[PDB]
Amino acid sequence: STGSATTTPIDSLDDAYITPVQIGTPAQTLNLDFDTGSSDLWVFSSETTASEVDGQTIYTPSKSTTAKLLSGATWSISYGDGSSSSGDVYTDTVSVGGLTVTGQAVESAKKVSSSFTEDSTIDGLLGLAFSTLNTVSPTQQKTFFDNAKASLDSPVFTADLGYHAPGTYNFGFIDTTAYTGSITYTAVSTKQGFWEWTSTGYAVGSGTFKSTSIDGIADTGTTLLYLPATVVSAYWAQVSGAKSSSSVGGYVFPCSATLPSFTFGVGSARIVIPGDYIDFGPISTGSSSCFGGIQSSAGIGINIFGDVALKAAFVVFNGATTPTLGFASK
């Protein structure tokens, strides 16, 4: 089997991408944030505290003839940005782009943190990291991809995120028309539960490529590119007037600037992030200070190849017995 679904930016900045997901019988379609940095499929629901729902579409398990309470199971997650959610668990039928999994754990939120409530466009998350990170207790549950894998034509999914435009998540096949050149594959460590890999270096604009190992994770659920402070300083030094602002929380730059590109290495291959992709717009409405899309990871503990980087590539998440990642230009 295969599946193919369009993923759509939630706003004009590409802050996140939503993909329609069918849950239950009859289908209830929710728009979920596909997140290769986490491993829970959780949804706003009829169980979510009413004051914490503000415009989201909810899953109502009592209206699904295939929903079954997973007795005794609870979940609770905290994300790298400080947000969180928690609740109980049902199993139900879940379909993405024509690919159906029966008995998928659907984690129903009883509580969500304010950042989720305040984002009316995201009805939940669909985690695509390794199932060892799934938070369901006392019996850890598998991701949608883990459940589908054995049925897929090939045990892979691909992320093709658009810049200011829709893109595609495919399951079970490589669309060879969706990229240019070849796909360069690189080793993955699953020891932390992430799609963790090592970039071979970087360049700023037309500058020389610096060969250096940068370990990080491919994370569709993170907006920006978070890299070591040395690398980030080298980038922003090429933008007149850019500076790190403690009060804003990262590098800012004059909105009048033209940003240089940023290149990262994948083996001997190179992925070029155009400068435009690094502009996240005014820090507040009407400001002439703009927020940068490349930020330091120093306070995180891990480097994160988030959407800024991934949307410059066609990305293969190869879930074979020994997982690997593939990157192609597009």
Side-chain angles (χ1 to χ4, degrees), residues 13 245 247-249 251-253 255 279-292:
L13 295 179
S245 167
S247 62
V248 174
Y251 280 88
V252 297
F253 67 94
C255 294
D279 183 355
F280 280 75
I283 61 171
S284 293
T285 301
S287 180
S288 70
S289 185
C290 275
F291 197 67

Side-chain angles (χ1 to χ4, degrees), residues 3-9 17-20 34 96-97 128 157-163 165-171 173-175 177-178 220 310-311 313-317 330:
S4 182
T6 298
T7 193
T8 299
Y17 298 79
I18 50 173
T19 308
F34 283 23
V96 176
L128 293 168
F157 68 90
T158 65
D160 180 8
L161 302 179
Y163 168 66
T168 305
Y169 282 103
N170 290 330
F171 293 83
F173 72 106
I174 302 307
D175 178 358
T177 74
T220 58
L310 302 182
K311 74 189 177 184
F314 177 88
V315 187
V316 180
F317 294 80
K330 66 187 184 190

Side-chain angles (χ1 to χ4, degrees), residues 198-203 209-214 262-267 270 305:
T198 302
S199 173
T200 49
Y202 68 98
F209 186 84
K210 175 72 168 182
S211 292
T212 184
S213 294
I214 303 171
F262 184 87
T263 300
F264 63 95
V266 182
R270 306 287 181 254
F305 294 86

Side-chain angles (χ1 to χ4, degrees), residues 15-62 64-67:
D15 281 318
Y17 298 79
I18 50 173
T19 308
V21 178
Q22 282 71 50
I23 308 176
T25 310
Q28 300 178 38
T29 298
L30 276 64
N31 296 328
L32 304 188
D33 185 351
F34 283 23
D35 180 12
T36 62
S38 68
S39 306
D40 288 48
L41 192 175
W42 74 260
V43 296
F44 279 79
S45 76
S46 57
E47 301 179 331
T48 308
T49 298
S51 64
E52 297 179 351
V53 184
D54 186 8
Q56 295 80 11
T57 295
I58 62 167
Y59 170 57
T60 303
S62 66
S64 174
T65 59
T66 43

